[PDB]
Write a protein that binds this ligand. Structure first.
Ligand code: HEM
Ligand code: HEM
Ligand code: HEM
Ligand code: HEM
Lengths: 146, 141, 146, 141
């Protein structure tokens, strides 16, 4: 996408403080709790019946970590998200059949998680920068659908 | 909220659809799969090629449900109760897709009811499809 | 945007049969009827109280014609909608304050109007091509918002 | 549909908001204008710079309305009747923007209620804001 250098440095700085494994597990878990229809892709994962079951489910945590790790790696290529995520885009379409609306939901939950985590440090300008990034990633992941 | 005039408009239009309801249902699906390819992610188990029996069959089911909703327009939540359970707990289609199908249904009706599809009827039909969509997503959480 | 040559020729062929003035008036009128909150920009236009008043309102017809004419001219530059609509984008943001969601609503109403007009000639593949075009135009018009 | 548990969660969270409701309302607005610039098209008559009295004032009004909705969560349509008339017939804000403000309100709450903003409360709050949004857009057509 297009971030101003001050937006880019805002995103970069905050992300250096993120425990990717922890935030990943939290974001995926909250996605499954707040928007329960997203559970549709994960019934191989065990008990998802209550909020506590979802948040404590080890498969959810593991997958959350895998997703946010790939997300992390994309922050290093903000200039070319589409190229970075082309293969994953294809995979999510052809093999996993994930409606790309899910990427948008996850992006918004991730922003809530960052806000919860960082409190007042997650200022309105920083949120704005992260919104552009998550929209960009969702875009990039949806790009090769057909 | 459907006004009495909206209900009259929907019954009149759907009345003229009559026996073609199933054929129009299939056409709307095909329009949706071509115009909004992301919707195909919910049908990986179907042959989505043109004229496929699976799509025609599904189109007929969708159309019959809408027929049921028109007949019970004053009591839709009850009439569609089983269908809202099915979409909420089983199928779990993201709510945004209901809009997409609604639009394609509207286009299909427009293409087949030249005389019936007045501005006022168009408005009533869009309202009606939004209400059906609201009922079908009622129990998602 | 990106249309295959068969999509491009489908769009082009159908459009050669459109009376731009008539379809324009119809599409804008139906926008104002089906989504009445869009009337917010037009109270300078007179009586918009009933469907018949809206569809017969001469200012609505005139504006519809102006809008679809610009749309028409954009069909000639499908390869670069953003460049074609940059000035209008700016105008709609800075001076007219039109929420770009309105462009999407109009695009969908226009597709309904074409369907109503052309009946069975407006096949599923042709609709698909037009959906890409109207999304592209909405995009192009929203591009310079800030 | 808000379950009793959802209502308990919303009352608890909003309770902790208490007296800061107005300040949080303004922050949510500012977040919305920066993250989703298209929403500024509805406020051309405001000074939208940081700390502007107009935004703070408006934030307080938004917050008081939400406070009113929490107090009358069993009877929201009635409680917000004047506000739905106002948005439907006067302001005529496109319904998509309600989502955007709801998200920014959620972010604001998350940033200020570290202990309260559990997964279950998050879910209840999102549901609640969606219900408020539905009521405020009820009379648009
Ligand atoms: C930030 C956005 C996302 C990114 C970066 C991402 C990335 C990934 C990666 C790296 C994998 C592993 C691929 C492999 O094995 O080769 C994966 C798998 C998968 N993802 Fe995504 N993903 C994202 C969002 C989502 C969302 C929102 C959902 C659905 C709610 C989803 C559902 C899946 C599923 C079902 C798999 C398969 C897991 C398995 O085999 O057990 N992903 N994703
Ligand atoms: C106007 C709104 C809709 C109506 C009235 C409707 C109605 C129905 C009905 C009657 C069934 C058959 C249930 C049965 O077997 O007993 C069904 C199944 C299904 N629907 Fe919905 N539906 C609507 C919207 C959607 C949308 C928007 C999607 C996805 C884009 C969708 C995806 C499905 C799928 C995947 C099935 C299962 C098909 C199968 O496995 O055979 N539906 N729907
Ligand atoms: C296909 C999308 C659209 C295009 C191509 C378009 C194009 C135009 C053009 C060519 C003008 C005249 C500009 C000038 O005087 O220099 C205009 C004005 C205007 N448009 Fe748009 N427009 C579009 C959609 C919309 C929508 C959906 C709305 C709101 C519902 C809207 C509201 C306005 C308004 C209020 C004016 C000012 C009219 C006046 O001064 O009386 N337009 N537009
Ligand atoms: C949670 C949903 C919202 C609530 C509870 C809410 C509440 C209110 C209230 C209490 C007022 C003041 C009414 C008065 O003066 O008596 C108002 C005005 C207004 N609202 Fe809404 N609102 C909401 C969403 C929105 C959204 C999403 C937008 C646009 C992005 C919006 C735009 C406006 C505008 C333009 C005014 C007029 C401000 C002025 O001229 O001073 N509202 N709202």
């Amino acid at each position: 996408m297009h971030l101003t250098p001050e937006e880019k440095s805002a995103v970069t700085a905050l992300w250096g403080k993120v425990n990717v494994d922890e935030v990943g597990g939290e974001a995926l878990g909250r996605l499954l709790v707040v928007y329960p229809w997203t559970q549709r892709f994960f019934e191989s994962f065990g008990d998802l019946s209550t909020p506590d079951a979802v948040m404590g489910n080890p498969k959810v945590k593991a997958h959350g970590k895998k997703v946010l790790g790939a997300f992390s790696d994309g922050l290093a290529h903000l200039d070319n998200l589409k190229g970075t995520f082309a293969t994953l885009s294809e995979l999510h379409c052809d093999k996993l059949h994930v409606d790309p609306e899910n990427f948008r939901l996850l992006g918004n939950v991730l922003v809530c998680v960052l806000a919860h985590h960082f409190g007042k440090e997650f200022t309105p300008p920083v949120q704005a920068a992260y919104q552009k990034v998550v929209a960009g990633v969702a875009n990039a992941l949806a790009h090769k659908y057909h | 909220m459907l006004s009495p005039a909206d209900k009259t408009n929907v019954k009149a239009a759907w009345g003229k659809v009559g026996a073609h309801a199933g054929e129009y249902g299939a056409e709307a699906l095909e329009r949706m799969f071509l115009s909004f390819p992301w919707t195909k992610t919910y049908f990986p188990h179907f042959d989505l090629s043109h004229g496929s029996a699976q799509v025609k069959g599904h189109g007929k089911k969708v159309a019959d449900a809408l027929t049921n909703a028109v007949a019970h327009v004053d009591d839709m939540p009850n009439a569609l109760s089983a269908l809202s359970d099915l979409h909420a707990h089983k199928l779990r289609v993201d709510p945004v897709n209901f809009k997409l199908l609604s639009h394609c249904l509207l286009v299909t009706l427009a293409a087949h009811l030249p005389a019936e599809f007045t501005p006022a009827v168009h408005a009533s039909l869009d309202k009606f499809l939004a209400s059906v969509s609201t009922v079908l997503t009622s129990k998602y959480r």
